[PDB]
Amino acid sequence: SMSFPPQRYHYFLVLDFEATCDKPQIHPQEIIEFPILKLNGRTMEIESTFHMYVQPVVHPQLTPFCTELTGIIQAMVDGQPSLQQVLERVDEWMAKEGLLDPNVKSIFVTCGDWDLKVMLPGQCQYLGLPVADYFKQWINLKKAYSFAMGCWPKNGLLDMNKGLSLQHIGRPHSGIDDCKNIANIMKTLAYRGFIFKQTSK
Ligand SMILES: Nc1ncnc2c1ncn2[C@@H]1O[C@H](COP(=O)(O)O)[C@@H](O)[C@H]1O
Ligand SMILES: [Sm+3]
Ligand SMILES: [Sm+3]
Fold this sequence. Notes:
alpha/beta; six-stranded mixed β-sheet; 6 strands; binds adenosine monophosphate; hydrolase; magnesium
């Protein structure tokens, strides 16, 4: 096939939350890291980065497990805006990037469905906040990978990097680093000729 074919979107918006957690799981979970990488729709190159840590409210003190898992320390979320304000910052960032133009086509890309099917809508429902329409469609990279490679990856980014012989970027369970791996996997899948499609229902 053709390497780096024409794609259906002008930009891809790579997103990977980190959230409060514990062993056994904390309830409710709350977003504590909100990264978005804006990728050129054709080349998959990173052109802009949104990144904010978020101050949790229901369980404001990060557990030892959460800090061990994510590397996020208490001082990184203390003094930060809450999710409501971060969502307003995202909307302003989308506007300045030119992504609110109806003729500019973009879609979010996540590893799995959890981030936009479960985490964001669930916390927004808890807080009584509407979900912006652009969060309601996305590409699940694991499903896209399964069509591009003909196989179901077992453990997310690590196994997709393994299958494509890519070196892992940065630290697992860091939101921004997970985004960098998603973007690197996407670049390789496009190099192999894959055309990305919405997977969310
Ligand atoms: N092994 C785990 N045990 C408990 N919670 C987890 C685990 N892995 C991920 N999580 C939660 O899911 C969020 C997203 O995970 P990830 O995108 O894989 O870093 C984390 O920030 C945690 O809140
Ligand atoms: Sm993740
Ligand atoms: Sm992650």
